[PDB]
């Protein structure tokens, strides 16, 4: 909740966007690993009664 | 005034080197996996599922 701080931070470069891209890549690779571990078969079987 | 630019560019270089090191570690893991898959599937018959 500051305006001058943002004006001074915009002069540093692309650190904000770089950190955002890194965190987005982490968040995507988490779901990628979750799908690679469990979602190995594209067919949901069920046990007989 | 020059000291601020020097510090900023040095920090940028350090961040780039760190990112390149992490990416090189990922590429090393991928290359080890690829070499293992080569030596197993190509130079022989593997009984490992998937």
Swiss-Prot record, chain A:
It comes from the Viruses. Precursor of the fusion protein processed in the biosynthesis of the S protein and the formation of virus particle. Mediates fusion of the virion and cellular membranes by functioning as a class I viral fusion protein. Contains two viral fusion peptides that are unmasked after cleavage. The S2/S2' cleavage occurs during virus entry at the cell membrane by host TMPRSS2 or during endocytosis by host CSTL. This is Spike protein S2. It comes from Severe acute respiratory syndrome coronavirus 2. The gene is S. The chain holds residues 745 to 793 of 1273 of the full protein.
